[PDB]
Amino acid sequence: TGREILEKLERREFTREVLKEALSINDRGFNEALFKLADEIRRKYVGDEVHIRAIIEFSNVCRKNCLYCGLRRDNKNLKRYRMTPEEIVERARLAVQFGAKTIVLQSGEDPYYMPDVISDIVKEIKKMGVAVTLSLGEWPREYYEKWKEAGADRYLLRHETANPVLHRKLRPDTSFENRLNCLLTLKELGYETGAGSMVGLPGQTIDDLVDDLLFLKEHDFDMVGIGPFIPHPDTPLANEKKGDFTLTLKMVALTRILLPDSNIPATTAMGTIVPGGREITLRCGANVIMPNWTPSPYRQLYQLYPGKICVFEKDTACIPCVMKMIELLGRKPGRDWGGRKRVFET
Numbered sequence: 001t002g003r004e005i006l007e008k009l010e011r012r013e014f015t016r017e018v019l020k021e022a023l024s025i026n027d028r029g030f031n032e033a034l035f036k037l038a039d040e041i042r043r044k045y046v047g048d049e050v051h052i053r054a055i056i057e058f059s060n061v062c063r064k065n066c067l068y069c070g071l072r073r074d075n076k077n078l079k080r081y082r083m084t085p086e087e088i089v090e091r092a093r094l095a096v097q098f099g100a101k102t103i104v105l106q107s108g109e110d111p112y113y114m115p116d117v118i119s120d121i122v123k124e125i126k127k128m129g130v131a132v133t134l135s136l137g138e139w140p141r142e143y144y145e146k147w148k149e150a151g152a153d154r155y156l157l158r159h160e161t162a163n164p165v166l167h168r169k170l171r172p173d174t175s176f177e178n179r180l181n182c183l184l185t186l187k188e189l190g191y192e193t194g195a196g197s198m199v200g201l202p203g204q205t206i207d208d209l210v211d212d213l214l215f216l217k218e219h220d221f222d223m224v225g226i227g228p229f230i231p232h233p234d235t236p237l238a239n240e241k242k243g244d245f246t247l248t249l250k251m252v253a254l255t256r257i258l259l260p261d262s263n264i265p266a267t268t269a270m271g272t273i274v275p276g277g278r279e280i281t282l283r284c285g286a287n288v289i290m291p292n293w294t295p296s297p298y299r300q301l302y303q304l305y306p307g308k309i310c311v312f313e314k315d316t317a318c319i320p321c322v323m324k325m326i327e328l329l330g331r332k333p334g335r336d337w338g339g340r341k342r343v344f345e346t
């Protein structure tokens with residue numbers, strides 16, 4: 001019964017069987033009830049504050065060749081850019097001036113900056129009295145250590161898929177074992193550590209999605225970023241089907257249920273595949289939003305997937321826009337850095 005699955009979720013009986021059935025049931029009533037449960041749990045554990053993480057996509061140069069990603073090295077159609085360290089620091093300062101309490105630095109795996117230019121940048125941004133989150137991909141332990149010493153607070157490294165066979169096929173430079181080792185290293189070093197997966201990858205099954213949920217719960221990640229796969233025309237996966245918004249939303253809801261005190265963004269990919277998708281996601285378990293703070297003329301060039309929202313707007317538009325979103329949702333902007341606030345339970 002949908003009714004029995006909801007009761008087991010409410011009682012925290014998170015068996016493989018319960019999660020598979022939750023993801024397999026297509027009934028509208030069941031889905032709505034699941035979204036309501038996640039929404040309620042979010043309210044109870046993390047409150048009405050929506051934390052704003054200003055993201056600066058500072059380089060689209062990448063050495064890897066992930067089959068899903070528009071920044072993959074084999075994509076010759078893309079104009080490559082790199083922000084200078086001064087540009088990055090000053091752009092972070094402008095986000096802080098606009099009220100950002102977390103700055104996220106994200107890039108392709110661009111060797112140019114690694115490790116010392118990142119360290120220099122992180123040091124300068126930390127002077128501004130804000131949290132710094134890095135999302136730079138897979139690097140040696142020594143680089144992660146240097147960045148932590150430089151003052152980085154958090155690291156986002158989506159695990160993408162917990163199916164090691166699918167992972168190796170989609171990410172042929174690397175492996176799930178490497179990705180996990182990175183995540184474990186980040187945790188050991190004391191970063192708030194973010195993982196998460198794509199939904200609707202070619203060949204990905206419902207059992208795979210279950211495994212993603214169990215993987216997330218197992219490692220107790222501080223942040224979980226989940227979005228639909230969106231095919232990019234300049235990649236090998238150009239002709240594959242996009243991920244389903246409602247199934248993705250169910251993944252976000254179940255993540256909240258499983259990790260009630262975690263930070264969970266309403267990802268840009270959710271807002272890209274459905275108009276208003278971020279706002280829906282914020283009402284089904286999510287409590288974080290990541291406004292695009294990449295400056296013109298580079299915004300339009302950070303093309304992980306096509307159609308990406310916000311790319312045409314003036315490059316200071318997204319912080320005020322998300323403040324409006326948060327108000328019209330009946331929510332509040334985050335007051336502090338929005339670090340994970342653990343609720344220890346049974």
Ligand SMILES: C[C@H](CCC(=O)NCCC[N+](C)(C)C[C@@H](O)CS(=O)(=O)O)[C@H]1CC[C@H]2[C@@H]3[C@H](O)C[C@@H]4C[C@H](O)CC[C@]4(C)[C@H]3C[C@H](O)[C@]12C
Binds near residue numbers: 040
């Ligand atoms: C806005 C939308 C249509 C509502 C509607 O128009 N009803 C008809 C009018 C209802 N009333 C209350 C304004 C008046 C009626 O009482 C009287 S009458 O209909 O005018 O006669 C309703 C219908 C189903 C609702 C979602 C689901 O729950 C799941 C989920 C639960 C979370 O917790 C919050 C988010 C989600 C996505 C919800 C959001 C929103 O809430 C939805 C989309």
Ligand SMILES: Nc1ncnc2c1ncn2[C@@H]1O[C@H](CSCC[C@H](N)C(=O)O)[C@@H](O)[C@H]1O
Binds near residue numbers: 106138231232305
């Ligand atoms: N085609 C696509 N559809 C949806 N999300 C995608 C995508 N291509 C990439 N992404 C998402 O974008 C995230 C940021 S990629 C940039 C950070 C770093 N290079 C890294 O790989 O971790 C990825 O983790 C992936 O989940």
Ligand code: SF4
Binds near residue numbers: 063065066070071137
């Ligand atoms: S997902 Fe990250 S590592 Fe892979 S190609 Fe895209 S930017 Fe490079």
Ligand code: FES
Binds near residue numbers: 292309313
């Ligand atoms: S969040 Fe980018 S314009 Fe609305």
Ligand SMILES: [Cl-]
Binds near residue numbers: 102
């Ligand atoms: Cl963050």
Ligand SMILES: [Cl-]
Binds near residue numbers: 156224225226265267
């Ligand atoms: Cl994310």
Ligand SMILES: [Cl-]
Binds near residue numbers: 267268269270
């Ligand atoms: Cl995304």
